[PDB]
């Protein structure tokens, strides 16, 4: 049983939820966590979805090395792990473990791209990267090693690369919202937050109500020609002139599982959206000692067969050594969206009892309706999870016009949406001031930064001033405390 | 065009074949190679096959960390890469990159397994490992980083673990023989060659005729209780007694692509078995300037649609800036098994010309027969590739009775099958003597080791003596030079 309450000790609740459901295991190297099959299966599902979608765009998978030479990493010139010795033997030149693969892939890119006919070049890989920070890790959300995909494309024109950046960002919206039922906000990162060496960084941002923090959910960068200049990636037009390619890179990580967990979980533990649950329906037979158990289990198997014909993912928990009470809790903690109960009374009526994980609502369903009804219930659970989260997201954002409204909204664990002049020095000043005010507050018991400049801009009245400098406002920006 | 001949400069031929077909790219860190999509797709295919098959056995995927602490690696107590510094900051205790994950996973195993009801525990992961040897690498076959899967299971009894070892070894036979059309020999490794700390190691072995070398294709270990003792992995029976679990581990790598390449390739370059080719049929339209090109390309698209309805994997190379001659060679080098040619004369006859990659045989096929006929041709190419390789394998093995027959058979680039007493010291002596004889031979221009003790044992006459000690022979053993 999960016992910490999500709304009272959030970090303990999260730890319990992911450990008791068998999603993660601890490890003797700090900041690394084991992903057990119950979490792993969800990764496999979103991985298959995203793979299928990028294949339709002509992206192909590949595999580049996990090591990068010191001097190719220096061509770009920090949380980088260095390998220095093969066993006992010191290396002649230390090599780093990839934190990202731009400097690993792009010398190959330069070799492969010769003519405009070679473009676009579109590659992805699934692997893990390492970012070795000493700060406190958080399972899924901030870990020293994490699984991701990174996609890396090259085009003849800037407009083609930017269209691809936005197509991918839309795939990331679908990954969170369609697969994980997590609402996200599209937008552009500020100049100070954008990717090192990139031209423009787009993001989808999510929000964790319980601690008021925004979290970057996925990212899609217009690199433009910046890395092409660095690595001499050029193509020939049909007339023979050499031109720089225009590039994109984009990535999504197992952080997405963390965000799903926190968005949908409740005081009983995990709640997994039907579209990614590896077990959508757990069938629990009632097994009175004074019953035809063989008949009950037989009907369970028949119902499994029937539901699987509709591509529903079913498990029968027929263990006689645990009570139905124990099983209910066990599969609740694990987040299975639908529980189906079959005992002698149901068998005699030709119905089953079905309980949905998100609300506890129970239904009596005849066996003949079971597949279409469960399909409909699963789509309804998925939509409900998403819409309720969308409502919490919207309740979480305060639209302000002056800096004096910031700290009251932060103290409500809200994000703010404010008219901003987009001066980078002002973002630095806002970070430092809000951090100071937070510290001063904590003495009586930090920083607010930009999360993104949303694509969907509310109306900007003609003379509106930046909320912090009083200069002309340029656009609405979303700010908050952040991961 | 590939220009080195497979039968004359084998290593140059292999390099050309994998580079010119765009399968691999070089990298500035020795012993690591980039896998471009043309090779990567074949990995994805065999990966899907093996995943599907182990899932039916109840194995589930997971992901364990890439790092292992010095002292958990010492619990077992060398080609191990050590991480010592996060950027500038020296680590308090150096950590190694995984060469294999037994010591990473098995402390978790010990924590998770409490009762016999917890068994069997069956996990797999797909990742890369590093084995940092200074010797000369070979793309796919011996690399410093390589992709694999490793599966790790734990059972209540030794017989259950051994049945699983053999079930997996059969999956590896299917991986090579059914998917890659590469014949392999099942058997048990000798005491000196078996896995460190394991009880018994089984293998499937392949043979490379052009250099006479056996190569271990995949491996499936009975660990028995050895690692359970090391890591305290114990379970409780129903009466409450604690017993050691019995374990297996097993792995397969991208070496398998290397073996496929070398087995089927010819002087024109790659030949890819239809069951794993990412392009099974390349459609090449003839594009005379004085023709209805639109009609020709339209019919190409229709034929693609029709073939894809039969799950055939099709690409249309409709580029006008290359000749059909150039395209024929380009897709030959890449190993596409079937080429389909459509020009105005074919269109007028309602037929297509189809050329198979392995023999060059051409066929005229009416459009109505095209899907069933190509399906049949692809199964015939797959079978032919396999049977011819099976014949080369069989021609490659000499059955001997005395040590004086070894060097003549090695000089024929053959393996030998000999009655052996299985004394480990004799294997060491045979390695050293055959290496010396080889050196002495090379002066006028090394080692033979056991490859496996085959499951399929030829008849052993009642008084047959070991071929090297003259002691009683125990079993037939397969020996050869080796990777
Ligand atoms: C208060 O204490 C902290 C403050 N700041 C950092 C940490 C921290 C602690 C650690 F122990 C280890 C690390 C290193 N891992 C990461 O930084 C990281 C980044 C991301 N990112 C970055 C943005 C991105 C998106 N979208 C990009 C696509 C990639 C995405 O997913 C995802 C994950 C799982 N890990 C950070 C702790
Ligand atoms: C004459 O020069 C040499 C002599 N001896 C070694 C090398 C060499 C050169 C290097 F630069 C790097 C390395 C390290 N990589 C590997 O040892 C290795 C082993 C395997 N293995 C081992 C057995 C196995 C099977 N079945 C097990 C499942 C795993 C399987 O696939 C596969 C691959 C791709 N790499 C070795 C060079
Ligand atoms: O790390 C990043 O943000 C980009 C996207 C994945 C590859 N590099
Ligand atoms: O390296 C080996 O041979 C075994 C099988 C994969 C995991 N460890």
């Amino acid at each position: 049983m999960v016992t910490a309450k999500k709304d009272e000790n959030f970090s303990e609740w999260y730890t319990q939820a992911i450990v008791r459901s068998e999603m993660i295991e601890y490890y003797d190297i700090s900041g690394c966590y084991i992903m057990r099959p119950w979490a792993f299966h969800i990764w496999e599902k979103v991985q298959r979805f995203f793979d299928d979608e990028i294949k339709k765009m002509g992206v192909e998978n590949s595999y580049f090395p996990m090591f990068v030479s010191r001097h190719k990493l220096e061509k770009e010139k920090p949380e980088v792990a260095w390998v220095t010795h093969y066993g006992d033997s010191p290396l002649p030149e230390k090599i780093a473990i990839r934190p990202t693969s731009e400097t690993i892939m792009y010398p190959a890119y330069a070799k492969w791209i010769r003519s405009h006919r070679d473009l676009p070049l579109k590659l992805n890989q699934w692997c893990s990267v390492v970012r070795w920070e000493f700060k406190q890790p958080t399972p899924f959300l901030r870990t020293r090693e994490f699984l991701w995909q990174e996609g890396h494309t090259a085009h003849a024109t800037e407009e083609e690369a930017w269209e691809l950046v936005l197509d991918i960002l839309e795939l990331y919206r679908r990954w969170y919202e369609e697969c994980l039922a997590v609402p996200v906000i599209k937008g552009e990162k500020s100049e100070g937050e954008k990717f090192a060496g990139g031209k423009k960084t787009t993001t989808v941002e999510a929000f964790i109500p319980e601690n008021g923090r925004g979290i970057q959910a996925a990212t899609s960068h217009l690199l433009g020609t910046n890395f092409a200049k660095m690595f001499e990636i050029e193509f020939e037009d049909e007339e023979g002139h050499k031109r720089l390619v225009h590039q994109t890179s984009w990535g999504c990580t197992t952080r997405s599982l963390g965000v799903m967990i926190m968005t949908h979980g409740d005081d009983k533990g995990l709640v997994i959206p039907p579209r990614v649950a590896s077990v959508q329906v757990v069938i629990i037979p009632i097994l009175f000692k004074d019953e035809n158990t063989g008949e009950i289990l037989g009907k369970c198997r028949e119902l499994k067969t029937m539901l699987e014909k509709a591509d529903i993912r079913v498990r029968i928990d027929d263990r006689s050594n645990y009570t139905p009470g124990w099983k209910y809790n066990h599969w609740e903690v694990k987040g299975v969206p639908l529980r189906l109960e079959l005992g002698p009374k149901d068998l005699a009526k030709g119905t089953a009892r079905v309980v949905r994980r998100d609300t506890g609502e129970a239904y009596q369903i005849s066996w003949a309706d079971l597949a279409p009804k469960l399909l409909e219930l699963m789509e309804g659970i998925q939509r409900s999870l998403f819409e309720k989260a969308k409502a919490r997201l919207h309740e979480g954002i305060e639209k302000i016009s002056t800096f004096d409204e910031v700290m009251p909204a932060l103290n409500r664990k809200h994000l703010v949406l404010a008219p901003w002049c987009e001066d980078p020095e002002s973002e630095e000043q806002i970070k430092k001031e809000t951090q100071k005010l937070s510290e001063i507050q904590a003495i009586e018991a930090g920083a607010m930064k930009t999360l993104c400049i949303p694509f969907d801009q509310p109306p900007m009245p003609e003379g509106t001033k930046c909320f912090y400098t009083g200069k002309p406002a340029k656009r609405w920006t979303l700010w908050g405390r952040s991961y």
Side-chain angles (χ1 to χ4, degrees), chain A residues 1-54 56-71 73-76 78 80-85 87-242 244-288 290-344 346-435 437-461 463-483:
Chain A
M1 296 188 66
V2 177
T3 82
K5 301 205 167 177
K6 193 181 176 187
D7 74 337
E8 282 178 27
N9 185 346
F10 183 58
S11 90
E12 190 57 18
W13 170 87
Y14 178 65
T15 295
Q16 289 182 2
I18 64 186
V19 176
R20 287 171 200 194
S21 66
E22 303 174 294
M23 275 196 156
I24 69 136
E25 185 58 70
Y26 292 114
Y27 192 66
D28 70 334
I29 292 179
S30 154
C32 303
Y33 303 89
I34 296 166
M35 205 174 321
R36 307 179 57 175
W38 196 253
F40 201 81
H41 281 122
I42 296 170
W43 186 235
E44 292 187 307
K45 192 75 189 181
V46 288
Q47 167 182 78
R48 172 74 60 87
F49 166 72
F50 191 73
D51 257 339
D52 284 345
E53 288 307 299
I54 65 178
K56 292 186 310 187
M57 300 162 71
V59 180
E60 297 179 289
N61 289 336
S62 57
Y63 187 64
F64 290 76
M66 70 167 280
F67 302 113
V68 59
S69 51
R70 185 206 322 212
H71 58 271
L73 213 56
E74 256 153 25
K75 210 147 156 170
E76 216 187 337
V80 154
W82 291 97
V83 172
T84 55
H85 298 68
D88 195 290
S89 147
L91 275 183
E93 169 202 2
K94 58 172 183 156
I95 69 191
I97 304 177
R98 57 181 170 221
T100 186
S101 300
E102 281 82 4
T103 63
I104 301 167
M105 299 164 78
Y106 289 174
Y109 271 51
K111 173 174 169 183
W112 296 334
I113 295 160
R114 303 283 85 163
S115 148
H116 68 91
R117 284 173 314 252
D118 296 332
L119 296 166
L121 167 71
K122 308 181 191 188
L123 296 181
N124 175 71
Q125 66 177 6
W126 297 91
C127 57
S128 79
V129 292
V130 175
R131 306 199 176 170
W132 203 279
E133 315 205 30
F134 203 20
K135 316 199 160 2
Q136 204 56 209
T138 293
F140 292 117
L141 303 183
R142 288 189 306 207
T143 65
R144 262 154 228 183
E145 179 188 14
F146 48 92
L147 298 159
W148 73 355
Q149 55 80 197
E150 53 185 318
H152 289 264
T153 76
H155 311 257
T157 65
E158 189 90 323
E159 177 60 21
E160 182 169 318
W162 176 239
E163 277 164 35
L164 189 137
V165 163
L166 299 176
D167 289 339
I168 293 299
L169 197 63
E170 168 65 359
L171 283 189
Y172 289 152
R173 181 200 66 82
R174 294 174 60 203
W175 179 326
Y176 276 86
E177 294 198 335
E178 206 180 293
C179 291
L180 304 176
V182 179
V184 290
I185 295 154
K186 288 186 189 173
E188 149 189 358
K189 292 251 260 159
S190 71
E191 222 40 34
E193 297 275 310
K194 76 175 188 196
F195 191 61
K199 178 172 178 220
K200 191 182 287 310
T201 286
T202 67
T203 180
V204 278
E205 185 87 9
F207 169 70
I208 308 302
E210 280 78 10
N211 56 26
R213 292 196 188 255
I215 186 170
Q216 183 174 2
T219 198
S220 187
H221 313 285
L222 173 65
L223 304 179
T225 61
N226 295 355
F227 281 84
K229 316 187 150 160
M230 278 183 247
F231 287 94
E232 296 189 354
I233 315 163
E234 325 200 355
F235 70 97
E236 267 185 56
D237 67 19
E238 192 72 354
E239 287 153 331
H241 315 322
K242 279 187 151 157
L244 295 155
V245 304
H246 304 247
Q247 291 174 92
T248 81
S249 78
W250 30 277
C252 205
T253 77
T254 39
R255 163 180 296 183
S256 59
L257 278 72
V259 171
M260 163 205 79
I261 289 157
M262 294 180 159
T263 299
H264 301 307
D266 62 19
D267 285 346
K268 296 168 184 153
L270 269 39
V271 177
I272 306 298
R275 285 175 192 166
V276 299
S278 58
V279 183
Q280 287 167 328
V281 176
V282 62
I283 298 191
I284 298 161
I286 308 308
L287 300 168
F288 293 119
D290 184 13
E291 85 176 30
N292 191 337
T293 56
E295 185 183 37
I296 295 293
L297 298 166
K299 198 80 226 182
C300 282
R301 280 188 279 102
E302 288 173 13
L303 296 185
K304 176 164 187 287
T305 303
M306 163 177 320
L307 295 178
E308 288 178 336
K309 284 224 165 238
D311 294 320
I312 302 161
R313 299 183 290 277
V314 178
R315 173 179 242 124
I316 303 167
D317 185 352
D318 61 9
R319 303 177 269 188
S320 59
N321 59 321
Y322 292 105
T323 61
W326 183 98
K327 299 178 184 180
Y328 296 170
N329 172 79
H330 180 79
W331 296 108
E332 272 165 10
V333 168
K334 288 179 72 80
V336 171
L338 280 176
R339 152 175 97 237
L340 186 155
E341 301 167 1
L342 191 81
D346 306 291
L347 187 94
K349 287 143 56 187
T351 66
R353 186 167 133 100
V354 169
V355 179
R356 51 189 292 182
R357 174 62 184 82
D358 55 341
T359 65
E361 179 163 356
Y363 310 82
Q364 187 190 196
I365 303 165
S366 76
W367 302 333
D369 299 340
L370 201 63
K373 180 71 185 185
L374 299 189
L375 290 171
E376 178 187 280
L377 265 179
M378 281 198 304
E379 281 298 295
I381 291 156
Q382 182 90 19
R383 191 154 42 244
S384 178
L385 287 175
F386 174 83
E387 292 299 332
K388 291 168 173 174
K390 189 178 155 194
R392 296 189 296 271
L393 175 60
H394 170 265
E395 286 154 17
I397 301 161
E398 289 182 40
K399 191 152 106 61
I400 71 179
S401 36
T402 49
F403 190 78
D404 75 339
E405 311 176 79
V406 164
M407 289 303 302
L410 292 181
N411 300 332
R412 285 182 287 264
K413 287 137 124 208
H414 291 165
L415 319 178
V416 299
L417 186 62
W420 187 42
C421 75
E422 301 186 12
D423 168 26
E425 200 66 65
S426 76
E427 175 166 22
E428 210 34 63
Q429 283 164 334
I430 288 157
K431 275 143 97 157
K432 284 184 41 122
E433 181 172 7
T434 54
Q435 169 165 3
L437 291 151
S438 310
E439 298 176 333
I440 295 176
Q441 262 181 195
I443 304 190
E444 285 302 325
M448 178 178 88
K449 69 182 197 168
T450 68
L451 307 183
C452 73
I453 305 160
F455 288 1
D456 196 11
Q457 285 284 309
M460 177 67 78
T464 307
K465 314 232 181 133
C466 166
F467 78 129
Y468 177 87
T469 70
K471 312 169 133 103
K474 289 205 184 98
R475 274 178 297 178
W476 294 88
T477 303
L478 186 61
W479 305 75
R481 309 217 164 90
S482 165
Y483 279 82

